[PDB]
Design a protein around this ligand. Structure first.
Ligand SMILES: [Co+2]
Ligand SMILES: [Co+2]
Ligand SMILES: [Co+2]
Ligand SMILES: [Co+2]
Ligand SMILES: [Co+2]
Ligand SMILES: [Co+2]
Ligand SMILES: [Co+2]
Ligand SMILES: [Co+2]
Lengths: 388, 388, 388, 388
């Protein structure tokens, strides 16, 4: 009863994930840098479907046009020699000191312009490598103080930037969509569009909202103490789940970026279930960070554990939904009733319905048990593979 | 140098605020119930502008049509005898056991219908008393487990309900708007539309989004560790700030509902500033709870403290923005640059601009100090009224 | 492969657990009160070992000496008719309004005295029923403001109270020990001795520290974002784990008090393991609250789920420690090295050891991988009962 | 009405504070390294009393015995040329990869020994420079997983290390005391002795507890959502407040280390008050991090702001305690009653007191208002310097 991941599973990893050197705010790198080529081969041997990357992950900052091509060529040969795909690409607008006050919302106008040019350059490369989704994580978009950033003005600059990026893509006739990755805080005191909710609402104000979705991260939403599965549900409801970042997070605190399955285990189970039941076809991205206490051997074991955890949860969730005893329980809880419209008969009908108010026995309605505990235990028994 | 609140200040209070009996999950009521009439007179004497209420706050649950009128009549005379106004009204869809699984998103269809009828009934009364805004806090909309509620289905029921309420109002030709009050958790494990961001995004999916705004609460947003001022800014940017609930909250934990000014003091200062600079004209509502450790004398002192704190912060914020030294600091931080468009020259222009990339000196740009600390200290000195 | 709990398991429940009426800060009771006798029989039929209670749970407040005996007599017959035991008893110093400012640390001296008398009265009854541990949860000990309570003075009153209780017990020659249950916040803004750490340190200042331990709660420690298993470990290390309260908690927020197993599942697994490996013999108490959305049928299902979850985790933890592959992994991580003293050779020896500094190859030491990820995946595979 | 700090104020700063290069987990250094000598002169000109440092802050890692002396000599001349003192010193057991699994609790025995030797070496230097307190922050002491560290075994190693350090100091006849700085998490998933409470309790298990205190940090305690002033109070009560680290923290999240006064402003006011009323004589250390968005000019402005904020709060707290109206309010709240013993008359007396139970009118006692809101508003008016 083993769970071997295959390319068909659509499991992808970021060059920065297994490529993390282990540099933390209070420690130095515990591992040597990994050549992108090596990562592409190791991941392929593990059963990955593809890899994503930041412009600065593939081509070192300040690289000449000659070096640039050379870096891309090598990467291209690796993908060809393995069959790996590049479904998503993003831009690094947070590392370089120049982005200390942000990229698209930096107070310095000259910096904002540079941010757009650096991004557009990568979008072109992303389309060349075959990326279908372009993610944008504004890690420096925010502030540590109250009078340091006018959110109203910042939002204007944020929209302007995204609007321009949409005009460029549509002008080049590129078949690529944008995905905004929200984050509550870190490395900034407060980051703009901190949750999936703030990102979804901001997208509705863009000139072409149909060109923007959302790339929510398990750990990010949890950083604010929110229910990731619930967040994902809303995104799917609004048809904006263009991509997703899987990982682990131990409650509220710094961005752990643990391997998928870690941290909130039950949350992971409910997430996989929703993704499988909703029919999510997007790639199963893994934005994690192998612990700095591990070596190269540990890094590969960590990544493999991510795909394995997903497969295991996927199996338990399927068995949980296919279990008649569970199907019967769902009905006992009225899960089927929640699906039926409230007033399909219309407003006037509902207004003239005495059974809805005038002659509604609230006493008897309130006495009805929801039987939610029995259903949850059935879900727990399935997760722990202990069905008795 | 005193701060006497006047009706012109637009300070409003909820009947449940100063009317709180002090019943907590681990204790009984420490204060006797207050007759709505008494609250309307005491608040008027304090300088309040008006009071808001839940259908169940003014007319006891199960009240006969005869009792109903009687309760309203008395309340109406009090408002006339004092000049107090009723700018906002809401429905209690959380107290009664019948709403143990929610109101608009309850799994039981019969309950959902009853919830809509109970609401519509109050909307009518709200329009009669002169309410301009109708708030909806779905305190029971959520779940304690994963398989107990299908967020996708729940969102459908939530939209259906709001859509119907919009049809009723437009059908009656009522000049009233809706305001959704988000809350992360409590009393439910997880409440739907937990943040201002989730509420704003959900509103964009309604048939008539122009009829729905947002009533964010200081404590609620803080319950998720978010930046309230930032949240309010986004709302104003999207022109959805129809109402606001002021109060205090000590970090992340249960809903304290402390008097305005308490908890995050700096957050309160930045909030008042934004509200005053943005030109917010809506009422300054106070959704607080006088500590159960206080008597009737303490309740009045608590409410008065709310209006006083706002007035004090309002003064400090005004002095902070009018201070030349501060105006000069804002320029040093490039606050004025953040206001200028990024690429007003257009996309093609930005693409052909070598000064934005090809010949952009990032080294010199990165070396520029933001001078945010000096600005923040200037803001701190103003708040503490210690300008030296 | 079922897990039937037996009295030998030592599973106990509080009268307030399954007896919770469902009264929340925003809702009324959804269930009718349960007669203590009924709870004692239902729990016995489920396989419980015994039940605990607050003085106010068994004998209604203000009960006459005649009523008191009557309530005790009935309870006594139930225990005899079932074989259930009463391993722990506690006092209710939080419900009654009189305790609005606290019990042992109330500002009013007359209240503090009353609190001690009310407690002593119950200690006597606890010893009569056969209780071995007396828990003290200071739910009202704290404050909502800074100048409302002098922690230094409060700590004095707290010690005085506990010191007096120790003198009473030793004077009566009672064979009962005290257990302090810490809680970060709620219902008070901040509660004294908020964590297991603060309680353990405060106990070291008591006249007879050997008479005081600690009754940590899963949800409480989690309310501050701490690692419960780690907290329990420290308690065991200091030999102060006299009792423990099991339950569930979904991250940081109000006190959920969910059934054991819920909330942090992985945390529960590590907790059970430590309790089983350390040899904890104390009773497995369950301080939970059946969701108000459930009826009497749901309450029993919830309680049963608590015992079942423990048994399942107990099995997985045992298999995880007995697995050779795991034993080998522990060695690879140097878990065995952490057990060997650092400088058993002494200080002088360590000072003269050139291999510890002068000739210590830190480069090679740092390159050694901890192999913690492989061990964690092995722990995960065991928990999910998916060993492949 | 300005607040010029003087050496008499006892304001100290860590070399790593104003020396922070700005390297974050998602960004590079935005500022060039500062020569310790320059920091000692700039701080002196600002009015600082002295500076603290880690062994690796003054002497670069791997420095030869010849380089070591050279670094110390220069530093010594700076202190002489300015009059600055070195009240505290600490060891860097977190940066070097060798300490990836911890220092004193590392699984590798050879690493633990090296950690002790590296520490002892610095203790000697600390005593030479005139340090009175030696702080120990176990930033790497913890784990990211459950089976990666046996807290029981780890605690043994932690005690062994501290015990040995106490034997070395007493053997050398050094007049220096140890101070343990707790931290909930970061950079490790969970750090041992996460709160002031866990550190105080662990110290009571040391061979010579009289040689160990506690160095609590404002931001650290807040990282767990605890009340810093309350934490400090308990420490003072146990006479273990040997040192303290001042700074700012915006609720629950990563370690911001903002300048003193920032983050929780009210918490800062109550802290200063307690420190001034308790008579704390220890140095007012500032463990902060100047925002990476600032230049050298901003760094100095940030540090100056720390001393200024303390002085301002110190003034407001003094005026708040000296205000008769406040003194009268404290009495109205019974703050004076909380100071009087509960049962000075003894146990037997309290047991025979019918006025404490038999004839205690709880009804009238419960009706008494605490008047805490009035007192808090008086405290608020004083803080905002708005006494009307
Ligand atoms: Co992350
Ligand atoms: Co991500
Ligand atoms: Co609230
Ligand atoms: Co509200
Ligand atoms: Co609890
Ligand atoms: Co408990
Ligand atoms: Co810190
Ligand atoms: Co520190």
């Amino acid at each position: 009863m083993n769970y071997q991941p295959t390319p068909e599973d659509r499991f992808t990893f970021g060059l920065w994930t297994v490529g993390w050197q282990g540099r933390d705010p209070f420690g130095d790198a515990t591992r040597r840098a990994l050549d992108p080529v090596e990562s592409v081969r190791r991941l392929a041997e593990l059963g990955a479907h593809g890899v994503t990357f930041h412009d600065d992950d593939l081509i070192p900052f300040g690289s000449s046009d000659s070096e640039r091509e050379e870096h891309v060529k090598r990467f291209r040969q690796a993908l060809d020699d393995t069959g790996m795909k590049v479904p998503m690409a993003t831009t690094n607008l947070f590392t370089h000191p120049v982005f200390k006050d942000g990229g698209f919302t930096a107070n310095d106008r000259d910096v904002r312009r540079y941010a757009l040019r650096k991004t557009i350059r990568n979008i072109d490369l992303a389309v060349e490598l075959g990326a279908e989704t372009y993610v944008a994580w504004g890690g420096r978009e925010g502030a540590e103080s109250g009078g340091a950033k006018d959110v109203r003005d910042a939002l204007d600059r944020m929209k302007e930037a995204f609007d321009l990026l949409g005009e460029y893509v549509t002008s080049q006739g590129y078949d690529i969509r944008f995905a905004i990755e929200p984050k509550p805080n870190e490395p900034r005191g407060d980051i703009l569009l901190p949750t999936v909710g703030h990102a979804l609402a901001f997208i509705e104000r863009l000139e072409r909202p149909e060109l923007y979705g959302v790339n929510p991260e398990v750990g990010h939403e949890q950083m604010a103490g929110l229910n990731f599965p619930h967040g994902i549900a809303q995104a799917l409801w609004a048809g904006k789940l263009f991509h997703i970042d899987l990982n682990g997070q131990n409650g509220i605190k710094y961005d752990q970026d643990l391997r998928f399955g870690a941290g909130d285990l039950r949350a992971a189970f409910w997430l996989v279930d929703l993704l499988e039941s909703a029919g999510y076809s997007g790639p199963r991205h893994f934005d994690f960070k192998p612990p700095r206490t591990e070596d190269f051997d540990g890094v590969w074991a960590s990544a493999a554990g991510c795909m394995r955890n997903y497969l295991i949860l996927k199996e338990r969730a399927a068995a949980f939904r296919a279990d008649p005893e569970v199907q019967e329980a769902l009905r006992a809880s009225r899960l089927d009733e929640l699906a039926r419209p409230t007033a399909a008969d219309g407003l006037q009908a509902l207004l003239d319905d005495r059974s809805a108010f005038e002659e509604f026995d609230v006493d008897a309605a309130a006495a009805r048990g929801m039987a939610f505990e029995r259903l949850d235990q059935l879900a727990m028994d399935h997760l722990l593979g202990a069905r008795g």
